[PDB]
């Protein structure tokens, strides 16, 4: 009897946590608003990452040839490096130093010409 | 047999056939404005809201012969080897699908081909419209997208009533063992047994409602032909 | 169990004529061939002769341990697994006969008597694990012989799935001697 | 086992696990200045270097001596240790100095509402 | 006479006793380029491994520490198996200092190559490996003497998401098997002692 | 260990995959000393019990038995916000229905 | 009907299908309405009243986030 009531409310609760985490497949729901909540969801990380990209577009139209390059290097560090573990902090900063290095000697160029 | 999903769409067939519920003897109209002004609606809207409520304004004849067409070519297209791809691959990764509510790879490829299927069965039900513009249903927003997915229909599917009873055997409490041994061991066969057991019949009454039949075995019922 | 079921099916596929003695058994007992393997599954399970095949001090383990097999088995849901057995025992009484009379049933009854169970056993040292490991190295060597014995005919993927089968029983013993030597003695 | 239970103890005290500066910072927090055997004795330790409430030109001093020992020192190991892994702390270090040179680009171009709204549209999905 | 010499290597063993003259006097005139050529074609025409040594040295213009030659004065066919202990670890040496010098290089040209050939490794490679412990660090100073390193490990619960980078359609999982089957029976054909079935076996 | 033992790895290697893919416009040699330089560095935590030899031959005959040439590998944790967003997003399931 | 500014960020603007899409990069798109003015003593009055009147006819106008007729949107894009 404890045991019947223990198993109906168990029954119950798996029910219940099936259509929170299945429904999105079934059609069980005459307006599909649970399927409907995925595509939402799908659709704002969509949203999301394509804003990123574009906001990245217009960054990179929006500077100098030099800025240009330094702003890739930089997304791109940002974009995959960052989350990355096998990458060189130290070969980004290479680059950067290398970058900076021919900036470096283009002020003394137009400063001591 | 008083099957549940039978009954039910009986029940919707007649109240359609009703003819208090066709188009003609009403006309759509935005209450809530003081002033009387038409249904100002969108036009993906009326044109779902009108071919989910087919029945409604169609004749029982007509809805028969649209019904029988629209149903020979969502079998045909399901057919497809993409659609059986997608349908083994939900069926595959389901397991793990069931530890989140974050969507699987699978199932956002299975909304997009129940998109792709309610604007199909939406061109298929009006075939003979001639007041429709195909061209409309050619690129959708995301809410004109997510409105049309709502009232796709997979047809395919079992008709009878899901609802089923499973049993599970329940271990006796040993007359040997004191109250903490037998609350642990109780505690013990409830998670391992119930829990997997449980969890994977709910889920797989759920992959069921959403599995479509095989086509041969509609042949094979004579459901088809 | 169930290894020791699946080694059964596995070694009794091999003989010849085995299928239609099954189907005349089945016969006799109002059965089909799945229904004669789901009772035959059941009359294995014999918790009264389970009593006498183990030292005291384990039967509460061992009477958990296939309480949880049966309740995991297929025929779990045919009710209290026990009372279910004396059901059997009432039901087809002298069907357990059968259930070694068949030629495959025989044949794999015997190899398993032979190759598994050994006087030298005493059931109540059973609670050690020295000695359960000394007759899991006699088992795996009597298992090896046998293998070869098998292999001495059949002239594939039977006599491979046969040895694997032995070698899973060879470790299902090394993990819980008392357990599985009880199941071995109970089940012949 | 007692004596497991000792070993245990002691392996999760290794210089390994507990840090002994962290030791001796505990043992700082636990002695007063007096009973300080380590700083009771360097009477410039309690009047020069912490009896004084600004001591400018100590600490400038300081700050320089360590400034230039540790970049000849590091002019030297960036001088050769082409294959290493630094500590967690300084690739860290590092990494965020990137993100916030990224960052500071797209804080150029960006309008403070549009940074704030992705901002708290972001917050919203992750929650 | 000695890019005729190499023709001698490409031509019947009759001339290689005028090889074998010749190369005695390019041993004593101790040539730089020229005994690099003549050891790449004789142990071309023996072995591999000395002329590999011989020809990677010559790319890479490794003059100094030029013990080859005395290396190439072996009279073993201009050759000698079982190489002296220097011929041997001065190859070896030059391997590994080669490849760590093309790793650095390709690190400071793309930072991101070592991470794709990480990737690329492991991406269908056992799931065992997937549980490989992360690098530690090597660093020194007030860290690893004072205070405590912190980890590098992580979960290491990852897809991999594999997408052929020129479009075309990929193995499928039994093409992959098969494939991977028959590398390691050739591999197996090659290396008598190989645990590479046990592999084969998912660890 | 042997200089002869690593030119016959080199070899068989060589007649094995194709190091270009691994690593273009580049000697086989070089090649080769980067991949076991590699193969060191980060896969030595298996080495222990793992014939060396034995973890290049499995490690090689997976990145060709997925394919024989170029493709683009990303590793995703689902658990992981970013990643799942960059999971579903970077995935395309026609893609998957194309076999690319 | 748009400034220079819109088409050349519009152009920097890809990869977007429906509206609401677009409906999501509003602010970043806003840049077209810069309005540039000196610091003058008379342009700074002048400034403060256009921004007040500006604030104030918001409210009153009061249209949703998706209607923004005032900003440019894919149509012209
Ligand atoms: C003005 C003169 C003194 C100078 C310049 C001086 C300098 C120093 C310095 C530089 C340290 C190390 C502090 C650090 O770098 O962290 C030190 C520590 C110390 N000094 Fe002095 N000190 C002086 C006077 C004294 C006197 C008079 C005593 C004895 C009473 C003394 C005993 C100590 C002790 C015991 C330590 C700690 C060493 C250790 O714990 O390993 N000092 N002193």
Known sequence: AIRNFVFKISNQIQNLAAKRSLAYLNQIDSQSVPSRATINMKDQVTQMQREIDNMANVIRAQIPDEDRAEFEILKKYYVTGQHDSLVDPQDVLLQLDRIQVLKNLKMIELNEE | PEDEGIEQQLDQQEVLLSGRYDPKLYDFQEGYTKNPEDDQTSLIEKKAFKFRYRLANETSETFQRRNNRMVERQIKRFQQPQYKHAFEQLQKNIAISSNSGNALHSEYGYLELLSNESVQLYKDYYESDAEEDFKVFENLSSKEKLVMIANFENNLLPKYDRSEVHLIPKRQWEPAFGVWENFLYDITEYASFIAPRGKEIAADYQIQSAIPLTKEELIEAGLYK | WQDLSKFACLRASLNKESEKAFQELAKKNNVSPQELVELSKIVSMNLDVLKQNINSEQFLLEKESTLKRYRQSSIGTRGHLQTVNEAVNTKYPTLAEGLGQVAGYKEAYQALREIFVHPSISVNNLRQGSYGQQFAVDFRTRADEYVKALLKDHSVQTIQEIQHTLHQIIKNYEQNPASIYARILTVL | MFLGIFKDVIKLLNKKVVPVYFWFFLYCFLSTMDTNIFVSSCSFLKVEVFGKDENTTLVLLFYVFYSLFNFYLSRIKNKNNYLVRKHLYTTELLIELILFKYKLIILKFSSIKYILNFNVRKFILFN | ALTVKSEAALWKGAEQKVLSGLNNLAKTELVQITHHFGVNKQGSEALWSQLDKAAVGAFPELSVDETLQLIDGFGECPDSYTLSHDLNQRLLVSWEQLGKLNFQKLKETNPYFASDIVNQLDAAAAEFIKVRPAAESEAGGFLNSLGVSSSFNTTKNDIYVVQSASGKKLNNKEQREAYVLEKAQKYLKEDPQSKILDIIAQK | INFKTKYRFYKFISTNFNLQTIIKNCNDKIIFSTLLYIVNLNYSFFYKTIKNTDLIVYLLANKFSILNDNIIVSKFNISKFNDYIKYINNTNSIDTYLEN | ?77
């Open chain 7, 1 to 77: 009907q748009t400034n220079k500014e819109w088409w050349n960020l519009a152009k920097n603007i890809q990869d977007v299908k429906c509206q609401q899409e677009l409906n999501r990069y509003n602010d970043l798109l806003s840049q077209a309405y810069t309005l540039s003015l000196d610091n003058t003593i008379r342009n700074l009055v002048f400034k403060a009243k256009f921004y007040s009147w500006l604030f104030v006819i918001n409210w009153f106008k009061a249209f949703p986030d998706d209607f923004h007729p005032f900003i440019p949107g894919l149509e012209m894009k």
